[PDB]
Amino acid sequence: TLTFTNLTYWLINATLPPAMKYPGTDTTITRSDSSGYNRYVYVSYYYDPSTGYNVTRISIVGFTGDPTNYTNVLQLCNKYYSGTLYAKLVAVGTVGTTNYESYIKDFRVYFVNPTTTPNYVQFQGTSVTQSATGSVSIGPGQCATVGAYVLVDPSLPTSARDGKTVIATYQVNVVFSTSP
Amino acid sequence: TLTFTNLTYWLINATLPPAMKYPGTDTTITRSDSSGYNRYVYVSYYYDPSTGYNVTRISIVGFTGDPTNYTNVLQLCNKYYSGTLYAKLVAVGTVGTTNYESYIKDFRVYFVNPTTTPNYVQFQGTSVTQSATGSVSIGPGQCATVGAYVLVDPSLPTSARDGKTVIATYQVNVVFSTSP
Amino acid sequence: TITRSDSSGYNRYVYVSYYYDPSTGYNVTRISIVGFTGDPTNYTNVLQLCN
Numbered sequence A, B: 001t002l003t004f005t006n007l008t009y010w011l012i013n014a015t016l017p018p019a020m021k022y023p024g025t026d027t028t029i030t031r032s033d034s035s036g037y038n039r040y041v042y043v044s045y046y047y048d049p050s051t052g053y054n055v056t057r058i059s060i061v062g063f064t065g066d067p068t069n070y071t072n073v074l075q076l077c078n079k080y081y082s083g084t085l086y087a088k089l090v091a092v093g094t095v096g097t098t099n100y101e102s103y104i105k106d107f108r109v110y111f112v113n114p115t116t117t118p119n120y121v122q123f124q125g126t127s128v129t130q131s132a133t134g135s136v137s138i139g140p141g142q143c144a145t146v147g148a149y150v151l152v153d154p155s156l157p158t159s160a161r162d163g164k165t166v167i168a169t170y171q172v173n174v175v176f177s178t179s180p
Numbered sequence C: 001t002i003t004r005s006d007s008s009g010y011n012r013y014v015y016v017s018y019y020y021d022p023s024t025g026y027n028v029t030r031i032s033i034v035g036f037t038g039d040p041t042n043y044t045n046v047l048q049l050c051n
Helices: B025-029
Strands: A007-016 A041-047 A054-060 A068-076 A084-096 A104-109 A120-122 A137-138 A144-152 A170-177 B044-049 B052-064 B069-077 B085-094 B106-110 B120-124 B137-140 B144-152 B168-177 C016-020 C027-033
Touching: A007 B144, A041 A068, A054 A068, B025 B069, B052 B069, B052 B144, B085 B120, B106 B168, B120 B144
Parallel strands: A007 B052
Antiparallel strands: A007 B168, A041 A054, A068 A144, A084 A137, A084 A170, A104 A120, A104 A144, B044 B052, B069 B144, B085 B137, B085 B168, B106 B120, B106 B144, C016 C027
């Protein structure tokens, strides 16, 4: 009954995403004990073959029974879209499983350079107690820097304190936006 | 035997398509890097002479290694019909071959303002995995918006990462009607 | 029975009528179907034929 179509062509274009990640400054602590890793903060990105996400892994060292605060880990800012870009962090949840995840008692990722609405995502062991943060405005050239906060329960077994072993793996998604 | 004909007299004067295609606010970014194009979304409706269709060329610049979605892409928005329009979405497949189509891991199309039953047709590279959606009401005054969701695998060569080259071309057939 | 039309003059979109033409003596039946440019047109119920 008067069924009508349009037959629309769609074309797509590919370019480097405008967010990009810099390793910050705390990747040059260059001081470490016999820990295999010669640094304290690692920043690198590899192409996931399953889904093609620009995965950016980070290695953070936490001190058992003693809270640790970071002030310069990652900075986010537009490098090609020269507009006012809005960013926000959303927590996803634990990925993988090492059965050590009950031994972490608090873990937070937050902005340091721009101060805004709550500006922290908190993980209580395996569950997520803070869903997402608010937006933040970023201009051309200036970047929002991201801190960290790790606290590991001191009851961790001695055999896993040498630093080789991984005790957690958290996914957080930071979402760019053109609106507040 | 007992065969009397019809001799139909069959009146046609086609009216303008009451839906019509509006660029939306995505073309109002008006800002871009030194990538050649001043705009990211090139929405334009062109008279196709090859087969006689009001084909609309719109550009959806999908960023490499990062799933990108758009909110205000296309407006199916009745200005010449005084009733309520009921539409559903069916996709065709591929047009031509850029030899880069395998680099797409997902291409699904979901609206923002109109909300209904699944409301997304999803491509899987060259193949198709979603058939169609349900009906949605579009009447006078209330105006329907079309969205998108594009993800590109970051294994694309840097030469095609400039945004000039077209990486894929798909057909979508939206069927607007006056009845559900 | 579409019974709906924009500012196109005809208050309907499908017409069915028949007149007895004297030139050929045929029960010529008149059907009118509105078209749309750049747009395939399909229908469901135009005419019913049965004894």
